C-alpha cells in the first residue's frame, strides 16, 4: 500500500545515515586491508549461491561486517569468522529459515568451530547493538524500480549486478550511501541497455540530480569496464545465469557520454 512508499523511502534515507560505517576504518586496521575485504565479500557471494540465499541477505552481511571492523580490530586469521558470523545473522534476519550453524561451519573447512561461530555471532550483536535492519543498495533499487516506465527486466538485473560489484570494493564504494550507489547503478544499467537517463521521477523522488550522481557513477563505470580483470569474480559468474538474463555479458559502454 504505497501510502507508505513515500514514508518508507524517507525513513530508509533516515536510517542509511545511521547504519553507515567509518569511512576511514581500513586505514586504522593494522592487519587487514581492502583486498582481503574483497576476497571475503566475494566469498560470501558464493556462500550465498551455494545455499540459494537472497541477495538482500548478502547485502546485509556486508553492512554488518563494515560496521564491525569500524569499531573492532581484527587479525587476518579471524576475518573469515566475522563474515561467517555476519551471514548467519543476516540469514536469520532476512531468510525464511536460515542455514544450520553447522553449514556455515562446514563451508569454512573447519577453520573455526561451531562454538567460535556462535561466540562471534554474540559479539557481532553486542558491537552492532542489535541494529540489523540496515537499509541496502538492493533495498533502494527495489524502491526505484517501481518508477521505471515501464519495467525492463534486463535493466533490473544489471542494476542489481552493478550494485553487488560495489560491495566488493571498499576501495571507493564506502564513501557513498546506499541510495547514491543505487542511483548510480540504475542510471548506469538503464544507460547501458537503452541509452536513456536517470528519470525525472527519480530525480523528484530522490532529490538527486544526475550531476550529484556523477562521482559515484564514474567510479561504477570504471568498475564495470574493469570487471573482467578483477581478482574477484563470483559476482560475474553469478550473473551469467538465465535468472538475470545473463546481463553480466552485454558490453559496457566505453563512455558515459555524460
Amino acid at each position: 500500500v504505497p501510502d507508505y512508499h513515500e514514508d518508507i523511502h524517507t525513513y530508509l534515507r533516515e536510517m542509511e545515515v545511521k547504519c553507515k560505517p567509518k569511512v576511514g576504518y581500513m586505514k586504522k586496521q593494522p592487519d587487514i586491508t581492502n583486498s582481503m575485504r574483497a576476497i571475503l565479500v566475494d566469498w560470501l557471494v558464493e556462500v550465498g549461491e551455494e545455499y540459494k540465499l537472497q541477495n538482500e541477505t548478502l547485502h546485509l552481511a556486508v553492512n554488518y561486517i563494515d560496521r564491525f571492523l569500524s569499531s573492532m580490530s581484527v587479525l587476518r586469521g579471524k576475518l573469515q569468522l566475522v563474515g561467517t558470523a555476519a551471514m548467519l545473522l543476516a540469514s536469520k534476519f532476512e531468510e525464511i529459515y536460515p542455514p544450520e550453524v553447522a553449514e556455515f561451519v562446514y563451508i569454512t573447512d573447519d577453520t573455526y568451530t561451531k562454538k567460535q561461530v556462535l561466540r562471534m555471532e554474540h559479539l557481532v550483536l553486542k558491537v552492532l547493538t542489535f541494529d540489523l535492519a540496515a537499509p541496502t543498495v538492493n533495498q533502494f533499487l527495489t524502491q526505484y524500480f517501481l518508477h521505471q516506465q515501464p519495467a525492463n527486466c534486463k535493466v533490473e538485473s544489471l542494476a542489481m549486478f552493478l550494485g553487488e560489484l560495489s560491495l566488493i570494493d571498499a576501495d571507493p564504494y564506502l564513501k557513498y550511501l546506499p541510495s547514491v550507489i543505487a542511483g548510480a547503478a540504475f542510471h548506469l544499467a538503464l544507460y547501458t541497455v537503452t541509452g536513456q537517463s536517470w528519470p525525472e521521477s527519480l530525480i523528484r523522488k530522490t532529490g538527486y540530480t544526475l550531476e550529484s550522481l556523477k562521482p559515484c557513477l564514474m567510479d561504477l563505470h570504471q568498475t564495470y569496464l574493469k570487471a573482467p580483470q578483477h581478482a574477484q569474480q563470483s559476482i560475474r559468474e553469478k550473473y551469467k545465469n538465465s535468472k538475470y538474463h545473463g546481463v553480466s555479458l552485454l558490453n559496457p559502454p566505453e563512455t558515459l557520454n555524460l
Partner: peptide, 5 residues
C-alpha cells in the same frame, strides 16, 4: 574454504 589472506 579457509580464506587465503
Amino acid at each position: 574454504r579457509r580464506l587465503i589472506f
